[PDB]
């Protein structure tokens, strides 16, 4: 009982976990991709009351992305833009 982290799996048009259509703007920022496959990982950490997003192209496979996403959500380094260049 100490660490404060919130991970969520936002996907398709039903991505607004319950009723949180935040990133929804990105899906409609200009008639972007909307083939019911809009998958985006959203993780909120102790960033002075804030969070970050992460576009995903394919997560269904194996641990190869399981651990890769876990770290991307709350790792030691991050904010490098390198790993993002490999995915995005």
CATH code, domain carrying 65: 3.30.160.120
Q: Cβ of 35: how many Cβ atoms within 10 Å?
A: 7
Domain span at 57: 1-88
How many domains does the chain contain in total? 1
Structure token pair of residue 18? 């319950």
Q: Three-state secondary structure along the chain?
A: CCCCCEEEEECCCCCCCCCCCCCHHHHCCCCCCCCCCCCEEEEECCCCCCCEEEECCCCCCCHHHHHHHHHHHHCCCCCCCHHHHHHC
Instruction: Locate 39 and state its tokens.
Output: 């998958």
Evaluate whether 40 touches 72 at the Cβ level (below 8 Å). Answer: no
Going by C-alpha positions, the residue among 64, 54, 67 that lies closest to residue 11 is: 54
Technique that determined the structure: NMR
Pair 75, 43: CB distance under 8 Å:
no
| Separation of alpha carbons 41 and 20, rounded Å | 13
């Amino acid at each position: 009982l100490f660490i404060a982290t919130l991970k969520g799996i936002f996907t398709l048009k039903d991505l607004p976990e319950e009723f949180r259509p935040f990133v929804d703007y990105k899906a409609g920022l200009e008639k972007k991709k909307l083939s019911d496959d809009d998958e985006i990982a959203i993780i909120s950490i102790k960033g002075t009351q804030s969070n970050h997003v992460l576009f995903l192209s394919s997560y269904n496979s194996v641990d190869e992305i399981r651990k890769e996403l876990e770290e991307a959500g709350a790792k030691i380094n991050h904010t490098t833009l390198k790993i993002l260049e490999g995915h995005l």
